[PDB]
Amino acid sequence: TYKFVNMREPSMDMKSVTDRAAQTLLWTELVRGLGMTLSYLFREPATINYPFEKGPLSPRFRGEHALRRYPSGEERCIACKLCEAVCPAQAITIEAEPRADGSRRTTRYDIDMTKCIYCGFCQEACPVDAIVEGPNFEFSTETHEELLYNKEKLLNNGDKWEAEIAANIQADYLYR
Amino acid sequence: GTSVKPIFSRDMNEAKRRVRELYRAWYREVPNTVHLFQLDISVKQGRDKVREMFMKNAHVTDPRVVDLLVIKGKMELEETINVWKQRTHIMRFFHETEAPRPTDFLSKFYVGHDP
Amino acid sequence: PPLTLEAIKDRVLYVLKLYDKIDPEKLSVNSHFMKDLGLDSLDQVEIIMAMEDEFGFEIPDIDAEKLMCPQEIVDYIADKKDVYE
Amino acid sequence: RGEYVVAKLDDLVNWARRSSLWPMTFGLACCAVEMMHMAAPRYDMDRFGVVFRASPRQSDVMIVAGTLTNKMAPALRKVYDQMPEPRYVVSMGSCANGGGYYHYSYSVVRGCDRIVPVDIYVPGCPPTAEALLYGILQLQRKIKREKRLRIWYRR
Amino acid sequence: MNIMLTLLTNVTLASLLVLIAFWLPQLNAYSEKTSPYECGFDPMGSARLPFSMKFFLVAITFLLFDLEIALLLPLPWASQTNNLKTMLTMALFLLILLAASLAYEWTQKGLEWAE
Numbered sequence: 001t002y003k004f005v006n007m008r009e010p011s012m013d014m015k016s017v018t019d020r021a022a023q024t025l026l027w028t029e030l031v032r033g034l035g036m037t038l039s040y041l042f043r044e045p046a047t048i049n050y051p052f053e054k055g056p057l058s059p060r061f062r063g064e065h066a067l068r069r070y071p072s073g074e075e076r077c078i079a080c081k082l083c084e085a086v087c088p089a090q091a092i093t094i095e096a097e098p099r100a101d102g103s104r105r106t107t108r109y110d111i112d113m114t115k116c117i118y119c120g121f122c123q124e125a126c127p128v129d130a131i132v133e134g135p136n137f138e139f140s141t142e143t144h145e146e147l148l149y150n151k152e153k154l155l156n157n158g159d160k161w162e163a164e165i166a167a168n169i170q171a172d173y174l175y176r
Numbered sequence: 177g178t179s180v181k182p183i184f185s186r187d188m189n190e191a192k193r194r195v196r197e198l199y200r201a202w203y204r205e206v207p208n209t210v211h212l213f214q215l216d217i218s219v220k221q222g223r224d225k226v227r228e229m230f231m232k233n234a235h236v237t238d239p240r241v242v243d244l245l246v247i248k249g250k251m252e253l254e255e256t257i258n259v260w261k262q263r264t265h266i267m268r269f270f271h272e273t274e275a276p277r278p279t280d281f282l283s284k285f286y287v288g289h290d291p
Numbered sequence: 292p293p294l295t296l297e298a299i300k301d302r303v304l305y306v307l308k309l310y311d312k313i314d315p316e317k318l319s320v321n322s323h324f325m326k327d328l329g330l331d332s333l334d335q336v337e338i339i340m341a342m343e344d345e346f347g348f349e350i351p352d353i354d355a356e357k358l359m360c361p362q363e364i365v366d367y368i369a370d371k372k373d374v375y376e
Numbered sequence: 377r378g379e380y381v382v383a384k385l386d387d388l389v390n391w392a393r394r395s396s397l398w399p400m401t402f403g404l405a406c407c408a409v410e411m412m413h414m415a416a417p418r419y420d421m422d423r424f425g426v427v428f429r430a431s432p433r434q435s436d437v438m439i440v441a442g443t444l445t446n447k448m449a450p451a452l453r454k455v456y457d458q459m460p461e462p463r464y465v466v467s468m469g470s471c472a473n474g475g476g477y478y479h480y481s482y483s484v485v486r487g488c489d490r491i492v493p494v495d496i497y498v499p500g501c502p503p504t505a506e507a508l509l510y511g512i513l514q515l516q517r518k519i520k521r522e523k524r525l526r527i528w529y530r531r
Numbered sequence: 532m533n534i535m536l537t538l539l540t541n542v543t544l545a546s547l548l549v550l551i552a553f554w555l556p557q558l559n560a561y562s563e564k565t566s567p568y569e570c571g572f573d574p575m576g577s578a579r580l581p582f583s584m585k586f587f588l589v590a591i592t593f594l595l596f597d598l599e600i601a602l603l604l605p606l607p608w609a610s611q612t613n614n615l616k617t618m619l620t621m622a623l624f625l626l627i628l629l630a631a632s633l634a635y636e637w638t639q640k641g642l643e644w645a646e
């Protein structure tokens with residue numbers, strides 16, 4: 001099924017022709033436009049008072065990355081390199097080795113946040129919920145170099161944001 | 177098959193004729209390029225650059241390769257004439273920023289592993 | 292008046308000795324550009340331009356390649372502009 | 377002393393310069409639409425004095441919103457040069473920051489900071505309109521702490 | 532004369548605003564900064580771009596209409612004559628001739644912005 005958008009012929013009688021002449025000479029549809037703008041002037045604006053008010057987000061929101069720990073304080077990352085393998089932008093650089101206690105742990109874990117596309121594939125690939133994208137989205141920097149994250153930087157991000165990261169994960173893990 | 181079809185030229189003399197026409201066009205264009213793009217080079221420098229670009233391909237014997245080289249040269253000439261290229265594009269034939277690379281064995285040995 | 296044969300020969304001579312790779316002392320009436328003066332066909336193409344900006348008219352590729360000796364340019368110019376001294 | 381007057385004058389000029397940050401719409405790619413979303417009613421960048429401006433001759437900040445390609449970089453540098461001073465550059469999105477998804481491409485310049493000096497790097501692909509607004513307010517706070525007249529007084 | 536003082540004050544204050552506007556800012560200018568603006572590239576000078584007979588024709592037709600308007604301006608005092616029928620006849624005559632000029636320009640292409 002289809003429909004025509006502009007297949008109406010105007011009526012050609014006295015009253016219709018006079019209606020169109022009055023519309024031509026008295027600018028009635030221009031007055032309708034003025035009325036629409038005037039009606040919008042008396043509507044409450046949709047503006048929010050940033051930064052005192054914030055745009056609404058969801059637990060699934062993909063922001064700044066973080067490396068997480070177990071309740072014991074032990075790191076979750078066991079350096080499987082799945083996130084580095086799946087990373088569409090090749091933003092993840094990993095080096096690992098046996099730790100002094102024998103654990104399988106990273107010695108390098110870099111994310112080039114200027115290479116990153118913030119797709120969240122890394123946190124999908126991760127089998128232990130080690131790498132996540134956190135809720136933070138206000139981390140603009142004055143230099144390019146502060147956006148090339150380190151393992152220390154990402155672990156400090158995890159320690160900084162774990163309280164709300166864990167709540168978001170608890171909110172959404174049953175969908176995953 | 178044993179033989180192949182031409183691009184334009186059925187022979188090497190035809191390819192040379194078109195090469196000469198393209199060289200003529202480029203040689204006449206160079207002064208207008210120097211003036212219009214406000215290049216800081218001389219017309220002698222630009223025409224010597226045109227000649228040196230032509231001389232890179234002097235070893236070509238295949239008339240089809242010569243024809244495609246002429247096609248690409250005419251394309252470049254039309255980018256230059258119509259001012260589709262910027263000054264930076266015209267000045268890229270002159271690698272003014274790149275440092276003089278070594279050529280002899282000893283300096284290449286000193287600076288790294290590349291042959 | 293239509294410039295005579297020597298009125299073409301001297302112009303050819305001057306524009307030929309303005310060319311860098313052509314030595315004035317090695318340049319003669321019949322100094323063939325390639326074998327005598329040691330030039331390329333790109334050099335010949337370049338000098339043919341210098342025969343176009345002076346004499347006004349345009350020499351096309353079909354016969355501009357035929358202009359090897361400085362006398363041959365003179366004869367071509369004389370023929371083209373209906374010059375018969 | 378006379379350094380109090382210079383400090384007050386610097387404060388005045390830097391309040392006037394950050395209260396009328398007029399940016400130039402350099403919308404190259406997907407980051408352009410989140411920036412006009414920061415323009416949209418929900419965030420209303422005009423309420424901060426940040427107007428919708430025009431030709432670089434009346435622009436104070438360049439927002440590089442999108443991938444910069446090799447074919448496009450000379451134009452970006454040209455319009456950056458044509459901006460009157462003081463002028464600032466905000467790099468918005470991964471592509472403008474360091475190449476992003478297209479970092480390893482033959483035709484993409486890896487970060488606009490190879491072409492222009494950048495004041496603020498807004499991360500994200502794309503950064504949300506709120507993230508770009510945060511970057512803009514951070515740029516405003518950068519302007520607040522400039523000491524141009526105090527530098528001059530101690531020269 | 533009060534009006535002369537008023538004009539002097541207006542012109543003087545406008546020029547003073549120029550002087551503050553055009554000397555107070557701190558400057559640092561280079562060649563590529565003041566280059567003519569062409570949306571990220573360089574402009575072509577070409578040769579006398581502002582052409583087309585239509586721009587000149589609208590100016591000429593405005594000139595002639597403005598002359599007839601100059602003929603119409605004395606009308607508020609013209610209605611104060613005892614010989615009102617002659618004055619009305621002549622004012623309406625002038626307005627019919629204005630309408631006739633408009634109609635003749637209209638019908639003979641004239642006011643059109645053609646291909």
Ligand code: SF4
Pocket residue numbers: 083086087088089090091092111115116117118119120121122123133
């Ligand atoms: S969010 Fe995507 S692009 Fe960024 S590090 Fe993770 S996998 Fe790589």
Ligand code: SF4
Pocket residue numbers: 076077078079080081082083084094122125126127128129130131
């Ligand atoms: S963060 Fe997760 S996916 Fe990446 S190496 Fe560590 S355990 Fe593997």
Ligand code: SF4
Pocket residue numbers: 405406407408441442443468469470471472476477500501502503
């Ligand atoms: S950073 Fe992401 S959203 Fe922005 S232009 Fe590049 S690919 Fe598009």
